[PDB]
Design a protein around this ligand. Structure first.
Ligand code: NAD
Ligand code: NAD
Ligand code: NAD
Ligand code: NAD
Lengths: 334, 334, 334, 334
């Protein structure tokens, strides 16, 4: 009765996508693939430092593990092209390893027998990059490989859309104060990709770092292509992040109240709105893709010239996951 | 002939001031006042979590404690007007309690017999706010109460001065990714000043917060008064901070290379320059008031319209202290 | 009907006790007293760094705040003897301020009009110290002031009981690897109680510290009075803790299997048992007073002489709170 | 004249060994091997999060990098047997990768041309395990592969030796509250060795874990073989650690003062002694292999039966390094 999903890469995004799917009828994870044994997989599903204990029940069985009575098959195959996808009748592969972030590379799941692939990151190649409730409408059903964009792109897109539609975006710059992730080192050490900053002890530093979110926003919102750029500061929280966006607008005597109200009007399941003076732990586990913070809006006016700054929270884990899973469900139903 | 200094408030800034002063001939700390016993004071001078073990030798004696043979008298008097300053012949009080951040209030150290008061923070009232090597030249020696501004003002002033002198500052917005400080709570709890953000567990959160640095920059650099504003995100590192500044300039085809070179030309003892991909812990204990990071410069250009972003590191503790003590020496020598 | 509860001190234990009480029929919080405004109180109930967002709905109203339709009155009176307890018909005051940890002092709630006082810490004076499901049976209903003991006493008591009942306890030593609490400083600073270790940056240090739990265990379990002692290492996690107990027994050829089985047999609502390789974050928010961890049991045998070590987890916040509220319910129903 | 050292694995122990060797005449590092480029290597030697900026000057050159005028050749060869050791005339390889912790495996450096190998961890096979100033005297000069033991063994040995020599060791149990290391994950994720605890976010958890230090102590002190065991709690500090040891002694009316005095009498360059109430950050960068903390001694006495507990600090990085390099110097000079 259900769309058959396989999760490639049972990592933070992979396991949290598994949890979200439990809460979404019509979708079923029938297989999981990673580089480890069932014991570890089952254990990291039950127990989660920031996101809390898994609510149901998990036991290691023969082909894999059993979750709330349902069997999930598991695999330990680093080369996606060799996975038993045709055999298991996979509708969509959720690509969450970080190693298949390209159309041509992801094509391996298709050869292996899956109908479609949704990648949990920005991907190179000829494919659509989708932020749910910003541009998922651009999917027609004939896509075989699709990108879910990044946590940061999902935090930013709905914000940038409102700024542009309601005020006219001229240009802007972005900083995300971002929680540290699995690709930072625990202690100062060689970094696999040669990045001298990601090399550094993650939980002991403010670490400047690059991100394509603002540069590659034009893939989600074409009419503002090339008008945004920026970076990240990785800081010592384990999850939870904040996007600051500083912009020049066409409209002229813009106020705090006008920007805030425009944001509230656009609010939905993916784009939240708050006036509470919250902090990063308050968003851990939240399912908005972006939580716009009216307490942080600022307008600098000197004569007729204005800079407008806004800020939106996101749980780079669960917020991205909730968006990814919504896009999965929409993609599957075409 | 040594300048006699009393330190009011043997806290982070006060103890580090003491340490710096050991390295500057012509200055001598003769007394220290706080709310605690000698044992605690000596102990917190010897041992320092972020700044390391005190290099010299410290032992508790009768009137206070003895540092490398020299006696320091200590007091436990919360009412500054009751301190034996006239008796000890104090030239300058370094006011570091956080409770006398006002000209009229700080006047109490004068009544008590000190010649001058230097306040380790922004201060209200009719006084000069001094960032060394930006506007210390404004001191004429007739001042009795002076502000050394904030760690953030010191990180920003030299950057804003260059931007304005070389390019013409129209407007800008600031964000400091800032280490947590002693006025944040360890755990979520009522906050003394009623700030619902500073109330939250300091080491577990990205905490938005206000700062007057950018707004009160016009006190250090009058020709850009009212052209900057911004705030802070307090994050979980124990010291070390970064100021990001996003600006609109009058000059028109501005490049990364031009902005970077202009900063390098202004470098000195207070304003450092780096091209290394450093992170926050790399600036702990440094003595530049501001370390400009060329790796972080960005120029957004859409048609003829540009935004320019730059960033400068500072150890909110030691950088500010090194500036404070430079201003102290200069103020005393007039 | 409902037992009327007032909470004195709406801090970590106070707010979590409020939360627990929402889930326990027959109990109702009708008043709350602290040193802050309603805005702050409401806000700290909604938002909680380690414990998560309050599930219901909270709004500031006239006399205090409204939680899920029910009105809670709030007060800002530091002197308990002046609280309107007689007026509000208070059955039990939950004493959670940390400032009335003595029978004579807590007597102030009684004069003010409350029938009974339950203190959320160890307390001096002529009173019973109660760990639920170890010695709550010692309450007869004529008590007016009772102590709920400490988070550590609650972690230890059920473990010590089994060891003594099943094996004969000769002597032991204890260490709790304990999350940092609100009475530790954010940065190195004078400590109010003069403790040179609690003075130190909480989230940056392993900090040895005292605790009476093991020494004052004989108040909960008289038959082993004087046979235990030990201390704490406060470490940088915001909540969640682990007690290690090393003991000499009378019984002779003791095994890991015998100790673990004996603990399983004693398990209930208050004393959990696990064989999973969990870590501290997994116990955040848990409601057992003590979670025995079988994976950590060790027996050292040299000839006929044995040391036995065991370890039990506890969320120093929620685990203590669940125990406190169980004891409150039992105390009230007599 | 100078002993020629190659460092295999330019990691935390490898780079700090490099730093220590700068301070020790008669040793020279002439080559370094790792899995990364020179740019990374030089960069991680200049900047160190916990240990501070490298004091000298480092530049990337042709064959590797230049440190204070001296050339160090660098290699990127994961298979030790293929390194140019015979060609560079290597006297001792410092084995610091974590992958050659066995006599037979390490034998690859010897084939490659090195005369001797010192391994920076416990190692399996027929070799001596050496804690400097406890059993380095056991080296005769004919050894080709030697283990420098672990940081924990180095913290424990000199303590255990005094306890046994002066009191008679019957049995004991150990816990090290230990800083997190580079083999812990930044976020909950599959762990390469299948350890479900080491899999967990390092900087957010108290993580129980095994260590052979106490079990394999009999390799360093054979007369107490089989008398000690225990484990670790990994906690969120980035370096700095504490060993707690609980013991039963033959000597009967043992006091705190007797134990502390006995420790003081054994103090030297490897075994320090303190009566100050220090915390973990106070030992970062220290060069004692073990710092005995008299403030933490405890004696539980019930009738004639006593438990004795003691505690010694160590910087698991710099302490182990200082010991390792002392053993390297001694080994080389035979
Ligand atoms: N905040 C975030 O962590 C976040 C947010 C949005 C998107 N993403 C993206 O999601 C992807 C996954 O990220 P993550 O943070 O969960 O990382 P993660 O490291 O936690 O998970 C990666 C997992 O993939 C497994 N894996 C690696 N190579 C594999 C192979 N080739 N075959 C099968 N399994 C393999 C690893 O064992 C690991 O479990 C990345 O592209 C990342 O940018 C991450
Ligand atoms: N990064 C920083 O901490 C930083 C940087 C620049 C400026 N400042 C400013 O310097 C001031 C102090 O900062 P801090 O972080 O050192 O605070 P802190 O709490 O560490 O130090 C304050 C000290 O003053 C003592 N004290 C309080 N009232 C007193 C009184 N009435 N008489 C004598 N002693 C008293 C306290 O016991 C404590 O030792 C504040 O104004 C702060 O804004 C702080
Ligand atoms: N892990 C824990 O936090 C924990 C565990 C077990 C027991 N306890 C005990 O619970 C008590 C409180 O602990 P906490 O950690 O929640 O501390 P906390 O500071 O978080 O809470 C104390 C609250 O009491 C308020 N308060 C202080 N004095 C008051 C007064 N005179 N009248 C009314 N309100 C006052 C404070 O403003 C604060 O809101 C302490 O006795 C503590 O030892 C704490
Ligand atoms: N507290 C401590 O960190 C500490 C204390 C005592 C002993 N040790 C031991 O020292 C060893 C290294 O520990 P670390 O903490 O420095 O870890 P680390 O990961 O920082 O260092 C390991 C280094 O070796 C490199 N490497 C791995 N395989 C290699 C190969 N085959 N060829 C060349 N380079 C290779 C890695 O790139 C890395 O640079 C471990 O065995 C550890 O047990 C560590």
């Amino acid at each position: 009765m259900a769309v058959k999903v396989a999760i490639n890469g049972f990592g933070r995004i992979g396991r949290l996508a598994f949890r979200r799917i439990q809460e979404v009828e019509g979708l079923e994870v029938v297989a999981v693939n990673d580089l480890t044994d069932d014991d570890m997989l089952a254990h990291l599903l039950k127990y989660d430092t920031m996101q809390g204990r898994f609510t149901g029940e998990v036991e290691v069985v023969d082909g894999g593990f059993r979750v709330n009575g349902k069997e999930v098959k598991s695999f330990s195959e680093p080369d996606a092209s060799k996975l038993p996808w045709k055999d298991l009748n996979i509708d969509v592969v959720l690509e969450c390893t970080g190693f298949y972030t390209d159309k041509d590379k992801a094509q391996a799941h298709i050869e292996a027998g899956a109908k479609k692939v949704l990648i949990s990151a920005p991907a190179t190649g000829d494919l659509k990059t989708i932020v749910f409730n910003t541009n998922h409408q651009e999917l027609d059903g004939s896509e075989t490989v699709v990108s879910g964009a990044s946590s940061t792109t999902n935090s930013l897109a709905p914000v940038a859309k409102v700024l542009n539609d309601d005020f006219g975006l001229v240009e802007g710059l972005m900083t995300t104060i971002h929680a540290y992730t699995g690709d930072q080192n625990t202690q100062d050490a060689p970094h696999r990709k040669g990045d001298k900053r990601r090399a550094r002890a993650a939980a002991e530093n403010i670490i400047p770092n690059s991100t394509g979110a603002a540069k590659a926003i034009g893939k989600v919102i074409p009419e503002i292509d090339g008008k945004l750029d920026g970076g990240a500061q990785r800081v010592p929280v384990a999850t939870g992040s904040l996007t600051e966006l500083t912009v020049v607008l066409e409209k002229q005597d813009v106020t705090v109240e006008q920007v805030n109200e425009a944001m509230k009007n656009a609010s939905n399941e993916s784009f939240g709105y708050t006036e509470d003076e919250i902090v990063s732990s308050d968003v851990v586990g939240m399912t908005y893709g972006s939580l716009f913070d009216a307490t942080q809006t600022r307008v600098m006016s000197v004569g007729d010239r204005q800079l407008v700054k806004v800020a939106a929270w996101y749980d780079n884990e669960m917020s991205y996951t909730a968006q990814l899973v919504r896009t999965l469900a929409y993609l599957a139903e075409l």
